[PDB]
Symmetry: D2
Subunit: 476 residues, 4 copies
């Protein structure tokens, strides 16, 4: 009769099963409810609130071209807000799509019991995953604990889900500003993020075509290089649900059969490794559902509570050029390559030895794709929580990690133009360069480029004493 489609993090119209199912019977009107106080400490950060504002306006005009209007409501309790929207419009059903983070699971469990008190039929759908996490089990019917044990089952699952076409027409018979999504001082500096990004589902479709046709071919040899645009740059579109992940899986498995029929064995190997990256997004929702504070294996660790070392880390003034170039790209554009996120966060935890909660809260505020389940899997991968993760006893050599991800030094020279005439054999560790090499370029360490804020042999021996105390503070 009358159905509310409640948009939360599915801001698209293609392959939207809650919008497609409501457009079969009767009258539809779409609703977004901004209720950030139920998230608690996972209130959306500053750069994420800019992206929601831009793509809700993109979604509102596209629903108007199908013939409707998007209704906005601001409350401190969203379960009292859709119920007040039902009493106004006289609606009988509420349809929405699932979410899997642990805050929204107990929130969606309560809104179902809140609305059979008023006799409203509530239907929820799957719009985010390939399979649901209660479908992938082991031989005994128990959940997995490693990724490649989990991903070899999803590729042999005896089924696969489909892509729904969008509806042909919507019908209403007809709101708050909610534009509180930004402060007025931070407003012109937020608008400079549009030099690199453009939100909306119509732009997510153009970036999937641009990746499939240009650099998906070279992905198996280039996905670790930070020079050049070698990855898809799809992660803020995939976080807000502007591109369907089953739409990506279908199109990549169709390019793979054409390249196997040309015997292009490298382009075919690239299509296999790109789908493994999509399976890491599937796995982050999997262990969040099954094993829902966070990093408890580091709770007797002696952390250095130094706030000016934290200020030098986010300013990009540490004296380590891969860390400084990554922190300047993060502030300028709101995105980092995956291998640079490992570099700047291993530096914060192992070298400066600041608390990991401090760095997680800075990533939550400055990344455009700040995802609750993917930030958990990333910070557990660098701290050694995951079984098949990184080791904690190890510190990375700056010259070796420089040669892997930035072999010609062109990532450092783009973001630190003061080091543009420094040769590549010393550009990732300028404190080791001899004195006449440094002044053959225009570099004096301490005046126009910084000295290293901690020496590498200082923190390597400061960690082994700090590792060996939390081993005996845990046994007591």
């Amino acid at each position: 009769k009358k159905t509310i489609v409640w948009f939360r993090r599915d801001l698209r119209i293609e392959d939207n099963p809650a919008l497609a199912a409501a457009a079969h019977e009767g009258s539809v009107f779409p609703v977004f409810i901004w209720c950030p106080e139920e998230e608690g400490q996972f209130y959306p950060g500053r750069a994420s609130r800019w992206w929601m504002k831009q793509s809700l306006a993109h979604l509102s005009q596209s629903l108007k071209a199908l013939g409707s209007d998007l209704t906005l409501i601001k409350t401190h309790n969203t379960i009292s807000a859709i119920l007040d929207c039902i009493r106004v419009t006289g609606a009988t059903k509420v349809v929405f799509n699932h979410l899997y983070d642990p805050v929204s699971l107990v929130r969606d469990h309560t809104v179902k019991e809140k609305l059979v008190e008023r006799g409203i039929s509530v239907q929820s759908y799957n719009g985010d995953l390939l399979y649901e996490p209660w479908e992938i089990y082991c031989e005994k019917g128990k959940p997995f604990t490693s990724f490649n044990s989990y991903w070899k089952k999803c590729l042999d699952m005896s089924i696969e889900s489909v892509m729904l076409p969008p509806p042909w027409r919507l019908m209403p018979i007809t709101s708050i500003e909610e534009l509180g999504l930004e402060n007025e001082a931070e407003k012109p500096s937020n608008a400079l993020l549009t030099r690199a990004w453009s939100p909306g589902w119509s732009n997510a479709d153009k970036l999937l075509n641009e990746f499939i046709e240009k650099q998906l071919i070279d992905y198996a040899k280039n996905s670790k290089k930070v020079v050049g645009n070698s990855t898809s740059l799809l992660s803020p579109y995939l976080h807000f649900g502007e591109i369907s992940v089953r739409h990506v899986f279908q199109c990549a498995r169709m390019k793979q059969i054409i390249w196997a029929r040309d015997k292009n064995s490298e382009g075919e190997e690239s299509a296999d490794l790109f789908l493994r990256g999509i399976g890491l997004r599937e796995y982050s929702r999997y262990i969040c559902f099954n094993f829902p504070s966070l990093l408890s294996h580091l709770r007797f660790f002696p952390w250095d509570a130094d706030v000016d070392k934290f200020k030098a880390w986010r300013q990009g003034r540490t004296g380590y050029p891969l860390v400084d170039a990554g922190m300047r790209e993060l502030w300028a554009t709101g995105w980092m390559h995956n291998r640079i996120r490992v570099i700047v966060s291993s530096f914060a935890v192992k070298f400066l030895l600041l608390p990991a909660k401090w760095g997680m809260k800075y990533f939550w505020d400055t990344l455009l794709d700040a995802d609750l389940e993917c930030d958990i899997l990333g910070w557990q991968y660098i701290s050694g929580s995951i079984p098949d993760g990184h080791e904690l006893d190890r510190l990375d050599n700056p010259a070796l990690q420089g040669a892997k991800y930035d072999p010609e030094g062109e990532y450092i020279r783009q973001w630190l133009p003061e080091l543009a005439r420094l040769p590549t054999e010393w550009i990732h560790h300028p404190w080791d360069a001899p004195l006449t090499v440094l002044k053959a370029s225009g570099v004096e360490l301490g005046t126009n480029y910084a000295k290293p804020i901690v020496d590498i042999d200082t923190a390597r021996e400061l960690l082994a004493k700090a590792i060996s105390r939390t081993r005996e503070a845990q046994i007591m």
Copy 2:
């Protein structure tokens, strides 16, 4: 019979009248002589010696494909060096091309009398100019003193010179390394200039085609913008004589008649303004020939002899973002847009009030197109020596000169990535921004960006007291 073609600053084979005339009679062999001690204080700088080294090797292989070999000689006196090359090879003639800087004029005057002592016929040719400076006169037969009085005569001169084809074959019947053109410490930092530049006459021809076909059309509206490659980037090719200037004048006047026949009035107006820039190169040789220390109208000026202000100027750490971005581009690439060269040199002379000799010697060492006659006309244009030049009583507003040459702030954000989230209305003067605007971006002045090293009202009143003393020290 046997003819030496002495290459000095004409490193090409197309439109080379000394090479073309020698290839008519008999045996030819080419000679370069590196003799930098006759230049005195105009010894070629560090970046210029890198370009000569790369393009002599480019010229040597192209003369081999015509069938010869380039002979190199190093001496502290070049007039004793070609005479020793004549006695070895048994040559009868020496042909070369003219130069017009005041050191080479008295040096070429002496080598003619040095070689009729041995009975050697010496012929010199015009390879650098459209007309010779003893051909453009006024109505009474006297030289001009302004540029547009001079350039309206050259466009109505009753003649024009032609483009010689290269010879079809050369004939010898057959050297020092001279590779002393770089220090071994400065060698790997010099090689990083190849990220932006490629010397040689074959590359000068590809950059003339690339400019004529892409952005010569938009030159009349874009030649003052430093964002984007809006100019030709031909000046280090035109300084070393790898592209002929009569070849440029012919090809641009042929595009102008095609655009006038399509009634493309803006593309035709752009071709008129680009040839006016070539006439400024002609005019710099004109007043050097007629009026050959240099800036004597500022000789009782009180200069501040502060050497750490000079170190902060060439490091790009002054706190003025147009000056800092221009000084970082100059060190990284060896080239600046013409409007930025006015900005960074007016700042050194009017704000810091350092001696102009100090800044001229730094431009001589860091520019790839460091030309003796063009650096004279440029530094006389900013100091008020020229009649139709800049005023000396004026200081430029940083916001207004920012909006003219960098209207969207994309030149500052490329070279100073720390200011990438600062809005455009304050990016050229961050000390005027309110305090919540600066911390809405990641900018604290004094820690990750510098404070202005002198305030603008300090130096404006320091100049008016310094101007008014050299007015009375000159009358005494």
Copy 3:
């Protein structure tokens, strides 16, 4: 356990429901059986047998890259041939896809009862249609009789079918040449069809991308012009089942939502008219299933049994330049634009008044997309059998049908280069041109271009006497 996939007219691997269902359980091996004697008079023609030969070899190597081999069998009775293939390989199931022409419907009905005598499970699938013809009914549950009554129901059908991905791997545990598909005299003239066409499912995918990205935009204004490639040229791929028709419907309805979101109202109108052409392919299978000699409303028509008029028609020597250019393109390439097929077949039936069986048998032998159900709907559309078809009392003016489909005369000048200097106002009717116009070009009618073989006023009055006799021979 072991399953035969019987390929008949579904020569692809993407969206193949019989191949996809067999690849779930066990061992698969593919089989084609050439049995042309069960078709009777619908034995495949000469150009169709060339295309089957080229695309079976294309399908055989693509099944090898998935790990199998295609087995070929030649029999005069295909129901005795798959049963002999089961006894060899020890297979338990046979899966295939439906067909809807009236010969294959009674043949598939008998092979099901032939194989439960041996206890073999037989499954058939839908691979050719959007919906099955027993699903589209009227309000009373009866089949339609007009096209636009039928197509307005298919666009409102409460369901739609999906696109299956191809299998990841096939398994056999392992044949006749059947290459009898061409005679040895006709073999080198058949191979010249490759100048215009390339069979195989991998080429059907490249022609769908090429049409969606280039000229689908302009289809609503260009689909009646025979100058230029304005249509998709997909019909021999769609006849042999090398491209899926649900794959076309999905991709065209996705381009339609992007163009509606740019307010490109003409590109959106073109996507609506292209899907109406696909619905004509759906409708031809619909009335073949419900109303399964053929043109019985012309059975007392007095036909002229003149065999040299039939020889002049297929040679393209009639003196009517649209008919002659269409007959020369048909012999050279094996394809005609849809508006030219109306022209050359209305000419054979209304002007020459030859029997329509004679022209249908020539189209069956010379077209690459000679489809049984689509040739029926086409020849019923020109003869007036269909209710919403052409009128039979009318003859078309050659100048008016020339201006509609060939407005600048460039289709005639391509295929009849003798008329290249004839102006456009007379190029479609040269017998009406004045005598000095014809000899201002190089045209003398009767020597280098033919006179019209029948005059237009002769056959217009010969038809009205021939129409009015079959009206009274039918009432008796």
Copy 4:
């Protein structure tokens, strides 16, 4: 003071020495005089008069954009016409450019003596040649008699001429229609030549750029193939003087030094063979100047005066497909490839044995580049007049000349679409094909393709009897 620039066959403004010299002193006005009755039998043909009409209108508007107007005069005596134009405008000088055909040499000799009777200074210039024909001599100072003896001297001539820039402005202080250049019946068939050609000097410049950048590279391997556009298509621009031939020589010798510096030895060899074709245009003016009826070595030849064989030759209905395709391209477009002009004219002279005057008059009427001196050299090359020409005792095999210039048969299939399904081993000689091959395509010889009008063994023995009679009729 006042100067007439008399345009005859130099319809351009770039590199025009008579227009450039007049634009130095005073007032200029341009004049074309149409006087076709002084040419006698070399009255310009039908297709040439269409091109003059189109490019005089192109030249008139381009002189208006320089500020003048083109004056037209029609007379039966041009020497009385410019003298009447002098008396009207009060002009003092007449400047024009040389021509070298033997009619214009004695006409220009008389107009000089006609105008010193009135005291008018007459100056003539070189605008058509690289060198003048009184500058290329042998060792004794005598003219050459072979081409490669002549062209090895022009490449070693101790000089070369230059390219003048166009004037910047013209000055008048200010006519008949002459549009009689076409009949009103032939007017709409002449306008269809614009499908392939576009006259004017601005289009001659775009076709020189298009050839230098696309297919000059492949010229040494493709200049004998008639499939594809492998030559420059510059000959009607070079005949009417819309492109300068010194402009072509300069630009091709500049591409040759760039390709020699990349060691592109095939692109460099192509630039050498293209300039040899330009030297054939130079040589045709050379022997016309020195050895000024025409083919007197065939004057006792027994010619067959059959006028219906002449009608079948120009209709393209001989039964020889290379001759028929060349005659249909010539009538449609007005141009033929150089190897096809040898084929269709050797066929007219050796097979049909029609008088060569009959075929020369048909080429004069149907070619757009019908040049008096180049048609002489071409018809002397096929008849054996030239020493290094063709032999007269030989007749060419149609299969061998077919494989040289049309190896895949795609030139025949374009112009004779009736033979599109005939395989390549018989497409150049269909009378030798076996009977089942011809009817496997749609070819019956005598009905839809013609039988050969003379058999090849008939005319081979008819020529040897006709050769051997003019040997004894000449000795008497």
